[PDB]
Amino acid sequence: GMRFGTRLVHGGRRPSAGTGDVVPPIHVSTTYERRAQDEPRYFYGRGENPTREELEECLAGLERAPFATVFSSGQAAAATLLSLVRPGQCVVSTDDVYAGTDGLFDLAARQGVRVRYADLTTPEGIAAALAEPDLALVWIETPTNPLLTVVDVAEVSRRAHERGARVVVDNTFASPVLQQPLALGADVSLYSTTKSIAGHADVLGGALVYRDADLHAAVRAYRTTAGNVPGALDCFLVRRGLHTLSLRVHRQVATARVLVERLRASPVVGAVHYPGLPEHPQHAVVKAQMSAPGAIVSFDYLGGPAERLLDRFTLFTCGVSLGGVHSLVECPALMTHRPLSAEARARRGIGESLIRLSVGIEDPQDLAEDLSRALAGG
Amino acid sequence: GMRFGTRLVHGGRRPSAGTGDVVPPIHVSTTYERRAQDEPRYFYGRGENPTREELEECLAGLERAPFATVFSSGQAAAATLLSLVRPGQCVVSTDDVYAGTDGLFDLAARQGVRVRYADLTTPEGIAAALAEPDLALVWIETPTNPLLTVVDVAEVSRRAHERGARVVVDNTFASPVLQQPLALGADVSLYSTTKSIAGHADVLGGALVYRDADLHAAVRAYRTTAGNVPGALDCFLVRRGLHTLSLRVHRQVATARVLVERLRASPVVGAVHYPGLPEHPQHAVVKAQMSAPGAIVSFDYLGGPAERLLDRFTLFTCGVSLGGVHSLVECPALMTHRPLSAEARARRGIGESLIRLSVGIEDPQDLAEDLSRALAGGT
Amino acid sequence: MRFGTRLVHGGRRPSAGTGDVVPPIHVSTTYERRAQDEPRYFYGRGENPTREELEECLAGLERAPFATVFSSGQAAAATLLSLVRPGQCVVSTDDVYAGTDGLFDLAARQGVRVRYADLTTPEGIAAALAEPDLALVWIETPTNPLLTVVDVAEVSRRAHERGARVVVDNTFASPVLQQPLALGADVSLYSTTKSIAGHADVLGGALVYRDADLHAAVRAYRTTAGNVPGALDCFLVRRGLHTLSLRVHRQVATARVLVERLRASPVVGAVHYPGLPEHPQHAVVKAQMSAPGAIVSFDYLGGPAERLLDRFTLFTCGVSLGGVHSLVECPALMTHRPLSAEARARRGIGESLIRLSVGIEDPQDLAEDLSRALAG
Amino acid sequence: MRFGTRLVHGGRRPSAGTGDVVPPIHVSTTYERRAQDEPRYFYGRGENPTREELEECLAGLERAPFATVFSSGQAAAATLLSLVRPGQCVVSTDDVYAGTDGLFDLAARQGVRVRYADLTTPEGIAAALAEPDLALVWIETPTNPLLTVVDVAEVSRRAHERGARVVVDNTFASPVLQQPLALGADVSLYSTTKSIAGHADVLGGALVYRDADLHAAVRAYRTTAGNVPGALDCFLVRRGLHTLSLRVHRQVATARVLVERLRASPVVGAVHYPGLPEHPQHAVVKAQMSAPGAIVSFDYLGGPAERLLDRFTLFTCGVSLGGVHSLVECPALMTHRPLSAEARARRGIGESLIRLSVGIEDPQDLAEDLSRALAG
Ligand SMILES: [Cl-]
Ligand SMILES: [Cl-]
Ligand SMILES: [Cl-]
Ligand SMILES: [Cl-]
Ligand SMILES: [Cl-]
Ligand SMILES: [Cl-]
Ligand SMILES: [Cl-]
C-alpha cells in the first residue's frame, strides 16, 4: 500500500509491545526460552531471528514480493540459489557476469552442472541459449560491469519460462530503487546488500527476493544447513542504511550524469559508457526497464598509463566495491578483472585503459573537479 | 577540495596506515599502551579517543570552525557551556527555549547564576535584555519550538558582543545544513545530535562547535572532569548518520512544504506555523539566515480534541523527539509541554489544540494522505 | 605464552600510532590501495584485520599455524565437507550432530559416500577405515546427548595409515579441555556460537589446522561461498574468548556437583557424564580430556518429561549449550524430535532422557533448582 | 539467588513473544505513545530498557533497591556531588582519585566546603566529622596507590550521628569483594569502566543506594545534565558483568602469587597489598573485604621507574585497572604526574613506586614477566 520511500522506512518495522520502541531493538540472542511462547516460533539463532526477519520483510516489501531471505554476503545468496541446480541440468548465463558468480559456476560445473554462456542481447543469441536441454536456470546480471550493457529482463523471462526454467536477475548494480526484476517477469532478484542497499561500506550481506513458496522452503533449508546466515548486528546495519537508499541512489544518479558530461568534453577520454546515453546500444531496453540509469560510469582513458591516473584522485578513493556513500574509482584490467588474461579482456571489450567510477553522495562539483584534475595531470 | 555535501562524507575520515580502511575502524579501547606511540597522545578513553575525535573533526568542518566537542547528549553539551557561567553572572535567553535548557537554567540558578528571559524578536526586547548587568551569556534557540518564531542571530550577536557576552545558538532544529550560527556571528553552535544529525532515532548525543581556543580548553577540561563523554560505538552511529544529513534534510524540507499546503487548505486548521510562509512574522530574518525553512511544522487543530486527532494517524508516529527518518506527531500541551500549567501554556501561546509535526523521509504523498485522513476524522 | 595468557593476548595486534590495548573494530568493507605499502587488504569478504586477529587467537590456543572463522559452526563444517569429491567416502558415527548429518545428506546428494560406523571398538574402526577412497574421518567427541567418547589418537593413527584427513568437532569440550591436533587429528572444528564466544549473543564457526594446502583450499571456498562472519560478530567472539578458561572450569566444577545430586535422586535412573569412573570409555576420557566437560544427561523417572521441564525456575528450557546461562532440554521433545520414536530407541535416546548444559551461575542455586524440578 | 547467579540473571527481563534469553538491545531514542499499555517509555535520555536491566543487575549485587548508571565513573561522582549545596561540607581523604579531586575543586568554586582528613585514625575521624555543615563523607577504600584502608562501618556510624550521607567509591574492590551498603554506607560508587565491565572496551559509571529521595534527585540530575550512557555501552557493561566473579577471583589469586615474587626480589623495597599480615589496617581488611583485591604496589630499588617499565613484555604500560589485560604504571610518572614532587612526597608516593593491575593471564606467565623486568 505505502509508496517506495515509505517502505524503506517502515517495511518490517514491527512494534515493540509494552515499550513501544520506534526503532526495533536488536535481537542478538542465539537462543530462546521455549516455555513462554504462545505460538513457539523461535528456537535457535541460525534458524530464526526477529531482527533478520524484519530486514527480510523490508526487502520483500520493496518489490511487493511475499518472500526474502538474507545471507552473510552476496556470494552466499548466489551460492544458495545455484545449489538448487542438479546434476545433468543446465544454467545459462552471460560470460560477463561478476567474477564471484563465475567462481560459483565453476564449482557447479564440478558437481555435474552444465554452464552455458550466451549473448542475451539478441533474439538469435537468446533463442540458441534457451534451447539447451534440461535448462534449469537463466542468470541475468544487468547492467553488466564494467561495460554497462543491458539485458531485456522481460523478454528473456518470457522465453525462459516457455522452457520451464527459473530466471534470476542479479540486481545489485541498479538496486530495487531503479529496477524491479520481479515486476519485469523474473522469478528471483539477487543482491549483494554490501553495495548500495546497506550503502555505507561497513557491512557485508546478501539477499534473495522471490515469490515461489517451494523455492522459499528450499532456500531456507539450505541457509539453515550451510549456515551462511548474517549476524543480527550486521542486519541492523543493512536495515539502517536502507532507510536512505532512495535518497542516496537519486543523488548518485544525478552526479553520474554530471560526470558523464565532463567525460564527453575531455580530450583524453575516448569512449564513455553509461546506460543513460541516448546512443547506448540498448537505450530502448534501458528506458523500458530502469527508472533511472544508475550510478556507475566507465570510460576509456587516453592520457597515458591508467595506474598513473589512479594515483591522482584526491577525492575519489581507489578501491573495489561500489554503491557506497564514498565515490570509488578503479581500473578493471588492474583490479576487478585482473585475474583474467589480456586475451580474455580484449575478447570482453575491457581495454587496458578502461576506468570505472562508482559515484557516491559527495558534492557533484567537487567530484567533477577531482576527475578533471586527475585527467589533466600536472 | 570540499563543499558541504563532501564534508559530510569525508570530514574526519582519517586514513588507516597499513590496512587502508575507507571507513575508519571503531576505537573501543578505554586504555592505551604508552610505549607504542611516538609522542604520548592517547592515555585514557575519557580524555582521548580517535573515533570521537573523527566525529568532532567532521562536525567542526561543517561550519568551517577550528573546534568541536561531542557529548553523551544534547543536554550534556548545554550543561557544559552553562557550567562556565559564574555565580553572580547573568544568562539572557528566550522565553520559549527547550524545557531541558530551562531545567539546566533552574539548576544553574540554584548555584547563583542569574537567568533572565526576554523577547529577542524585537529591537526593544533585545536592547532591554542586553542591558542586564553581569551579562555573561546570550542563549539563542531559533527557530523556537513549537511556535517556530525566529531570532536574528547576526543582530543579537552584534549587540551582545558590545556588552562583551558570549553568544550560543541551539541550532538543533535547523542543523548546519540550513543555518550557520558561527557565520552569522555567534560564538557557539549547540546541537542535540540525537535529532537530525544522527537522524535515525537510534543514538543520543550532543555537540558544541566554536572557534575560541580558551573556550576549547575550558570545554574539554569540563567534559573530562564531569565525564559526560559519549561512547565510541555511539560516535560511530552519529558519524554514520551524518553521511546522509544533507540528503535527509532536503527531503524533509520538501515534504514539509507539501504538508503546509495541505494544512492551509483544510477547513479544520486554524493557525499554521512554518518559517517558510510569506506571512511568517519574521520572514525577512528567515530569508536572511536560513537556506531553507526546515522540517518542523505546527498548527492549531479545529476539528475536535487533540487526542482524537493523534489516534487517527497511521503513518506518522505519536511520540516526542524530531529530525529522524520516521515522521513524528506530537501535541505539545499533552506531551512536550505537559509539565507547564494551563496558564503558562496560554501565556506562551501553546494552545490545547496545537499540533506539531516532525517531517521524516517517507514518500510525501503517503504522509500527505495520512495527515488529511487524520484531519477529516470525527470520533 | 601459556593457555590463559593466549586467550587474552592471542592476536592482540598493536595499534601503531594510538596504542589501543583492545584492537579497534574494522567494519570497513573496502580499502584504499594507495594507503598500503604493499597492498594486502582489498575487500572485506577476502580480508579483514579484526577477523584475522580472532583467527590468530584461535590458532594460538592449539599452537597451530592456521585458523579460519565462519558465519556459523555449520559453515565451518560445510567448508570442510566441500573438499570431499563425489565417489569419495566420509566416515562418521550415526550420533553426529543433526546439523552435521544434514550436511552429510547434502553431500550424499552430490555423490559423496557417507558411511556411519562404530568408532568405539577396534573392529568397528577397522571395518570403517576399510572403505575404499576414504577421504575424511569425522569424529565428534564426546557425543551428544549420551556423552560417549571416541579415542582421537587411536582413530587418527589408523585413519592416517589409509591416507585420510581426520577432523574432530571439538565444540563440546572446547580447546580448554581437549586438543585434537595434539592428539593426532588434522583439523579441529568449532561452533564458536557455544562455549568459545560463551555469552549466547553471536553465531560463528571455526576450523583450526596445520596443513598449508588445506589452508589455501579452505580460504578459497570461504571467499567464493561467502560464508564469512561480520567484524562486529568477530569482536563479540574474541571478547567472549578472554574468559573461556575461567568459564569452562566453573562450568565443569558445577557439572560435577550436579552429577552427584542426580545420582542421589530417587526419580533419576541412568546418569551420563564423561567423568564418572564407571563411564565405559573412562580410560579414554582420562587420556584425552583434561576435565570431563559441562554437559550432563540423565533418565528421568518421575513422570512426563514436559512437566519436569515446566518446573525449572533457573535453568532455561532451550537448545544450544556452553553459554553463561544454564540450559535444559529433552532431546526426544526438542533436539531429536524430528526422529521417529523407533530411531530414538535405536540410538538409546529415551523419551525421558534429559540434558543439562551447565552455565556459570552459583552451583548451590543450580543444584536447588534441579532438586526442586525433579521433585524427588 | 546467590552472587554468581545474580551476575548472570540479575535484570534478565523476559522477551514476551520471542523468548530471547539474552535481552535485545534497545537502541531506539523514541517510543510510540499509543502502543503502550500504560505510558512508561517516552524518550531515551529518561527511559531505556537496556539501561534499566543493567541497573537492576547492579542493584541486585548489593541487595539494594536502586541503581543508576552513567556515561562514566566521573559522571556518577559528579551527580552525587551536585547534591551538596554551597556552604555545606564534604569530608574526604587526602588521597582520593584525581578525578574526584577535580570534582571537589569544581564544587569548591561553587562554594562547597571541601575538607580532607585521615579516616584511618579515631582522632582523624572525630576531627573530620566535627565539620559544621557536614553533608557528605567520601570514602575511597582501599586507597590508590598505597592501598591503605578505611573502616566503612566505623566511619559510617560516626557520620550518621552527624546526619551526613556516606559514599564509598568501591571501584577498586568491586561488589564481589566489598559491600559498602551492608557495611553501613548510603551509596556505593563505581567506575564500571574498570573491573565491572572488565574488558577495557567501554566507559561507564554507577551509583547503588537504598534511599528513595536520593533516587529521585539522582534521576532528575541525570535526566537534566544528560550524563547518560548509550544502550550499546550498557550492553557491553552488562555482558562483561557475567564473568565479574570469575575474573576477580582469578585476579586476586594471581596477585597473591606476584606479591610472593616481589617479596623475594632484591630490587624490591616496601610492598603494598591489603592481604599482607603486616598491612597497617589488616584487621579492617579482614572485617570488610572477602579477599584483598587485584592491585599491588611496591618500591622499585633498581633505579628510575622507566628502567623497569621498559622491560615488561606481558604487562602493558598504561593507566586504568581491573581489566582482563594486566597493566603496570608508575604513579609519579603517570597517574599522579600533575602533582608536584613535594605533594607526592607528603602523600608517600615515591618516584619509583610501581603499581600493578592484575589481569587474568596465566599467573606463571605474569610472574615470569615481572621477574624478568626486575632482574634486567
Ligand atoms: Cl520502469
Ligand atoms: Cl536545589
Ligand atoms: Cl567566546
Ligand atoms: Cl590434512
Ligand atoms: Cl530444536
Ligand atoms: Cl542517604
Ligand atoms: Cl567479609
Residue numbers in the entry:
A (entry chain B): 3 to 380
B (entry chain C): 3 to 381
C (entry chain A), D (entry chain D): 4 to 379
Q: What do the authors of the reporting publication say about this deposited model?
A:
The crystal structure of CalE6 was determined and refined to a resolution of 2.1 Å. Two homotetramers were found in the asymmetric unit displaying essentially the same conformational state with overall Cα RMSD of 0.143 over 1509 residues of four chains (A–D vs. E–F). Each tetramer harbors four molecules of PLP, each bound in a cleft formed at C-2 symmetry-related dimer interfaces. Within the dimer, one subunit provides Lys 197 as the Schiff-base anchor for PLP and forms multiple non-covalent interactions with the cofactor from residues Ser 75, Gln 77, Tyr 100, Glu 143, Asp 172, Thr 174, Ser 194, Thr 196. The adjacent subunit provides additional charge-charge and hydrogen-bonding interactions with the phosphate group of PLP from residues Arg 48′ and Tyr 46′ located on an extended loop (residues 14–51). Despite little structural difference between the two ligand bound forms, all four subunits consistently showed nontrivial local conformational changes involving ∼17° side-chain rotation of the active site residue Tyr 100, a highly conserved residue structurally stacking with the pyridine ring of the cofactor in PLP-dependent enzymes. The major movement of Tyr 100 involves rotation around Cβ-Cγ bond with minor shift of backbone positions resulting in a 16.5° decrease of Cα-Cβ-Cγ-Cδ1 dihedral angle from 67.4 ± 0.7° to 50.9 ± 2.4°. Ngo et al. have proposed that the catalytic cycle of PLP-dependent enzymes may actively involve PLP conformational changes upon formation of external aldimine as observed in Xanthomonas oryzae cystathionine γ-lyase. This PLP conformational change was not observed in the CalE6-MES complex likely because the substrate mimic, lacking the α-amino group, is unable to form the external aldimine linkage with PLP. We further simulated the dynamics and sampled the conformational space of this enzyme using both coarse-grain elastic network models and ensemble refinement methods based on the CalE6-MES complex structure. Ensemble refinement was able to identify the different rotamers of Tyr 100 of CalE6 covering the conformational space as observed in the static crystal structures of different ligand complexes (MES vs. sulfate).
We have applied ENM and ensemble refinement approaches to extract the dynamic information from the experimental structure of CalE6, a PLP (pyridoxal 5′ phosphate)-dependent methionine γ-lyase from Micromonospora echinospora, which is encoded by the calicheamicin biosynthetic gene cluster. Calicheamicin γ1I is a prototype of the 10-membered enediyne family of antibiotics that contains a characteristic bicyclo[7.3.1]tridecadiynene core. Among the putative genes responsible for sulfur transfer during calicheamicin biosynthesis, the corresponding gene product CalE6 was recently confirmed to show methionine γ lyase activity. However, the contribution of this enzymatic activity to calicheamicin thiosugar and/or trisulfide formation remains unknown.
